[model samples]
Target: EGNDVRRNFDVSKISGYWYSVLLASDVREKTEENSSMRVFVNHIEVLSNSSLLFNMHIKVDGKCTEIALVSDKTEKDGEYSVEYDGYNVFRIVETDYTDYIIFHLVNFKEKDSFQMMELSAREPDTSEEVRKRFVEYCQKHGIVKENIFDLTEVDRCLQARG
Candidate 1:
């Protein structure tokens, strides 16, 4: 039996803080018939509103460069957390038959040291390339983008965070 506790947070309340979300999905059967689910959230959302507007961007050379729409997760519920640094990219690895997971973005009072940047359209098409560059940038700046995933986990977390 797939009986697990899942958590979710409201992102609208913490509009100015940084956060990272992680989600997992179970895709075993081809027909998607037999499946179970689990989700969680690290922090609680304090905003009374249902939706919040936010942006996601990549930083390079100590400069905010790329940006995109970073919205709250209104569809599914899962575990989430508000952290000091936000994730730039995610990777995925595997999936099962009886479980699915995801993460969400929330608002906060503290301003993140990593400024939001815009995503460059000229960047590589694959996430691996993006990850390589991100790692290189981190190395040059003496920073580390923690929680970097491979493929399966990356997909799950991105979906949840989005």
Candidate 2:
């Protein structure tokens, strides 16, 4: 038997401004209830054997804090990571250029409660088929559906035009 899970995800095709559409996790609802977590994403310049800047804006205590993160190509194609303390910080669980992306943030050595995620896109709107495929991809990779929440309208970067 053999094993190959990924479908050739290139780092070149994903560089740009991606808006956070969904951030799903286990312990985000309570904190989010009082202050909805509005996150804005900006990923710039990453390619094979390269790196990129990942900046996120999160509303914390009535203030939007800009948390800077970094991304790097892991010497393996389709293998990339986003960091803060800078891979151990937050990570891209899986993806394919076609339509779906997954991110998993966990600090195992420090503790196990540090897992969080944000699945987003360049556009606020994604095709229904892409949405379904995203879920399916996550499901197959051991991510539970109950932990996933709809962030479509929750944290949009651009205000709708009148």
Candidate 3:
């Protein structure tokens, strides 16, 4: 439980279109097909209110469903608080700005808690190096190799919009 946010994280550089490439969680079923964690990240925006807007979509019941989540910035640079599924502390684990970003989410509901790691990329595909690194990062959180789900081959749930 010693996860730290990226040092001196730049919110501007992290804002843009992204594709959900990989997802990992302590709970195996959470990353399985059709779960709520299988969302397709479409875009991320740094709001004027200092919060982050996550525009995402997911395929549910054979239809595409849009979802928007707002995470309020905390006192720290790379940490945010979100009020969903009880409460969530979203932290930026790492990012290359031009390529990919890794985010860690810790959710708490009463005494129960779950940790999730997400790897989203600027492009449809991520480099092999970044993929390996993402795996290693998740592994440190007790997320084994088999728990990682590759979303690259999944059908895009959202189409490009004008």
TM-scores, all candidates, are 0.23, 0.66, 0.90
For model 2, residues 102-145, the per-residue Cα lDDT tens digits are 66555343434445666676666566766665666556656567
Better of 1 and 2 by lDDT: 2
Model 1: ten consecutive residues of lowest lDDT: 115-124
Q: Residues 1-162, candidate 3: write the lDDT tens digits.
A: 123235887677778998888988999887887776677889999899869999888787878888899999888777899887678898888888878889999888688988999999889888787899899999888899988988887776746431
Ranking by lDDT: 3, 2, 1
* Winner of 1 and 2 under TM-score: 2
lDDT of each: 0.28, 0.55, 0.83
Q: Clashing residue pairs, candidate 2?
A: none
Q: Which stretches of candidate 1 lie over 4 Å from their true place?
A: 1-8, 19-49, 59-63, 70-74, 78-162
Q: Which has the greatest TM-score? A: 3
Report the lDDT tens digits of candidate 1 across residue range 1-162: 233223333233233423323211212221121211111121222344443333342324433333333233233442222333343222111111123222222324256222111111111122444335444433444433442222223222222333
Instruction: Give the TM-score comparing model 2 with the true structure, all chains together.
Output: 0.66
TM-score of 1: 0.23
Q: Count of backbone clashes for each model?
A: 40, 0, 0
Off by over 4 Å in 2: 1-6, 26-39, 47-49, 81-100, 113-117, 157-162
Task: Rank candidates by TM-score, best first.
Answer: 3, 2, 1
TM-score of 3: 0.90
